[PDB]
Amino acid sequence: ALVYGQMNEPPGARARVALTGLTVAEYFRDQEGQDVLLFIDNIFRFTQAGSEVSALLGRIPSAVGYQPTLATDMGTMQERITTTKKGSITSVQAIYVAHLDATTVLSRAIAELGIYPAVDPLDSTSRILDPNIIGEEHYNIARGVQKILQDYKSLQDIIAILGMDELSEEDKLIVSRARKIQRFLSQPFQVAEVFTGHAGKLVPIKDTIKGFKMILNGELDHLPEVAFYMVGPIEEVVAKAEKIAESQ
Amino acid sequence: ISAVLEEKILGAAPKENLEETGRVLSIGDGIARVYGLKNIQAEEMVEFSSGLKGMALNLEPDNVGIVVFGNDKHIKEGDIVKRTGAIVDV
Numbered sequence A: 001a002l003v004y005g006q007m008n009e010p011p012g013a014r015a016r017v018a019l020t021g022l023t024v025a026e027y028f029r030d031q032e033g034q035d036v037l038l039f040i041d042n043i044f045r046f047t048q049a050g051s052e053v054s055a056l057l058g059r060i061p062s063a064v065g066y067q068p069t070l071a072t073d074m075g076t077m078q079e080r081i082t083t084t085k086k087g088s089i090t091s092v093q094a095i096y097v098a099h100l101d102a103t104t105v106l107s108r109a110i111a112e113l114g115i116y117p118a119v120d121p122l123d124s125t126s127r128i129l130d131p132n133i134i135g136e137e138h139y140n141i142a143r144g145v146q147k148i149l150q151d152y153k154s155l156q157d158i159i160a161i162l163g164m165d166e167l168s169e170e171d172k173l174i175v176s177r178a179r180k181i182q183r184f185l186s187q188p189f190q191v192a193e194v195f196t197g198h199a200g201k202l203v204p205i206k207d208t209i210k211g212f213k214m215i216l217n218g219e220l221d222h223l224p225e226v227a228f229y230m231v232g233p234i235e236e237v238v239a240k241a242e243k244i245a246e247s248q
Numbered sequence B: 001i002s003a004v005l006e007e008k009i010l011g012a013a014p015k016e017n018l019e020e021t022g023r024v025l026s027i028g029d030g031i032a033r034v035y036g037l038k039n040i041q042a043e044e045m046v047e048f049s050s051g052l053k054g055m056a057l058n059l060e061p062d063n064v065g066i067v068v069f070g071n072d073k074h075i076k077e078g079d080i081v082k083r084t085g086a087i088v089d090v
Helices: A017-030 A043-057 A070-079 A108-112 A136-161 A170-185 A205-217 A235-247 B002-012
Strands: A035-040 A088-093 B021-028 B031-036 B044-047 B053-059 B064-069 B080-087
Touching: A017 A035, A017 A070, A017 A088, A043 A070, A136 A170, A136 A205, A170 A205, B031 B080
Parallel strands: A035 A088
Antiparallel strands: B021 B031, B021 B080, B031 B064, B044 B053, B044 B080, B053 B064
8 A cells, every 4th residue: 555745745744644654554453463564765754854844833943853752753653663462563664875673785786696686695684683582593594694605705805816726625615605595595576577587486484494504504515506596495496406407 | 789790700700729720721742831720839740631640840920831641632722630739759
């Protein structure tokens, strides 16, 4: 459901568009018991519209505008985006290039490497990455993948400095596993199956955990790297590698 | 004859004990200005008609500025505010 506020609208109109979208999301949460996404574009323009409203009213000076606290300004909006026993509202702020629980950073360089989505694996942080919340095995796998990617970046720097032969075949095995991880991070999209021609797939979290655990353990280390590209599950990687081996 | 006339003029308006009771001149953003509360003290807790609490922070000659301990949607202009008689305590 789309709610729009133009730039030629008055400051009062743009300061309540997010409230209208939140109200539609709240109907979908309360009266249907659903987990509802709420995309806001953006919090900065919402704060700007609130600051313009406060400047027009003349009470609060322009030095203070729309704190995350202060339920009159934004505290009610932030606290109405929460998870309850009936449903949940998950806020996603579209930022174009302060209190974010998670952050997904999109980089041009990742898209230049052919990885879709172009999410940077090292610059995308999350407060939820703790052993006490998401489980110990999920944090261990995520930390191992991040460590392997950081070591791969250092190894690529070393290769660019001196050459591709360094520390026997252990660095080559690390590079091969990291490149298989980077290929496996890519995924076809359901919404972009007519612009790219690849059928998008939905991957459950257990399938991602199992697939990355098998890559970290080296259970799929004999498979080619290009067989890990644009594949949803890990059984699709095995089928892709079998089709590559049969064709080649 | 004149005193009865001024008594009728006074009785045309409702009787309010403005020393311990106040009427909300304006309620908004958790801060309500009230006409009345002539015997209020500084930092003194007050009760509204809806059951909310407030603290008398500003003692102005015309009104009393009270910070409301709760949402201001339950308070209407013209509601009854009464003193608790004591400074804010927990």
